[PDB]
Symmetry: D2
Subunit: 155 residues, 4 copies
């Protein structure tokens, strides 16, 4: 049953401590969702852009449909990921932002902070993000297309 | 005395209601800061990416040193602004994010949500963003340079 | 199948959103009726006078729930919880709104107008009113402990 | 003068009790934490720890409290049932500061499931370091809270 919707996951070093939580939260959104962990495999020092880039590139080719990125605050992951054309990476810190990133911006990557946001709210963020459809409205689609034109104008 | 530091400001339609607040909060960060309002001039309908692009291009050229973007949640502005090379636009919702986006990521645009974040916290965000210096640390600079290598790899 | 009354009060900064708070109660469903008790005007007011008015309504059961707003929400939650029978929850997001119900059977939601934007206030109100109490024994036990603290100072 | 800070948790927040002790000390050498929370990972009911800390504050045995549970809210409802206590649910710097500035809050309540530890640190430091405004309208409101408590005693 289902079309498999793969979700690539990456972290930095402080968020490596919650990488198994992120895997689990992705599966809790629904049985169609399959996590693909791309993050650091150990507690060694890492630079978040390297994992943002790995995830974001998978998202942009649609090797996976969605990404989940975690760092200290989420901010660094959101800046790095959005540098990949085709990506719409949303820094989410609550239910509202998780849902609205989907509804308005059809976001494809959710970025969270391990040092900022407690794990039960991260859970709620991921699940909300992965359960929430895009609105379908003309103005939202138009705005998203405008982002694509910004990318095209710098390519 | 001082070097003048210009700060470009842009909004969408819901955040046009607070554009005078944004101008004020930028001046309160210190008398070297000079706001340059680039956002909508009336309550007319707008698409946030048009103003994200305007502010982000100004920052990327260094017509201004910093930008402030406001929309519903902040998220659209961050996604759009980050599509301009040279921009590092941070979605901030509290003091900690405002500070850390400077300390770790040397962020040059601060993005806030008028529907999500009350004005006294938007104030605190802007002021904190504009008074907080970049850490200087080797690992933070190295990561920021990896962000630029992401942009160059798609140029 | 009575409707469910929801008393509402504010301080002066949150008077600017008193119409939004009435609206969001109604948006939680036709079974919820707002009862506005807050300042009628933009005059100076002290939050505890409105916290007390709402909280007394909840504690006597003239309403089922309360909504309080001030600058940050915190003032209201401190004041309202000084009335016995009140469990007033400062909420700032969906999770807090929901969990205050689930775990604490909270009867008053407090929000900040200076801190929290109106669409998240909306979500908080709607979630608070729609979410049921867990019914679980450990939560009921903890809530009974809170009542034992009030009774030890009555 | 030593400013003492009593600390309590529930079971989920027991996981960060060492953090809480640390962040209090990080607010200045004069702040001393007094850990009153559960000593192990056993089951507990937050109102029992809220009551412990809140009575210490209300009877002037310590100047401040810090209470942590899942969300912070249980602690803040429980603690505020003790007369003399002004317990503030804080989730960021602004709330931590303003609770002091406006309400001279004496207990800070935080959520371990909701707020990451580096923000909890900021909250604790800011709460302990920020002074009460002293302004007449704040003092009047705080005395109104005491009158609510006195009207139900």
């Amino acid at each position: 049953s289902h079309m498999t919707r793969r979700v690539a996951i990456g972290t930095d070093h402080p968020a490596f401590a919650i990488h198994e939580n992120l895997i689990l939260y992705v599966k809790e959104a629904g049985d169609e969702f399959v996590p693909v962990y791309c993050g650091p495999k150990t507690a060694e020092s890492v630079d978040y852009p390297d994992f943002a880039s790995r995830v974001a590139e998978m998202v942009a080719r649609k090797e996976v449909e969605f990404g989940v990125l975690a760092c200290g605050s989420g901010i660094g992951m959101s800046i790095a990921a959005n540098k990949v054309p085709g990506v719409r990476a949303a820094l989410c810190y609550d239910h509202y932002t998780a849902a609205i990133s989907r509804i308005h911006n059809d976001a494809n990557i959710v970025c969270v902070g391990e040092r900022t946001t407690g794990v039960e709210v991260i859970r709620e963020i991921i699940i909300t993000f992965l359960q929430t459809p895009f609105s379908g409205e003309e103005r939202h689609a138009r705005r998203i297309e405008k982002i694509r034109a910004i990318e095209a104008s710098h390519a």
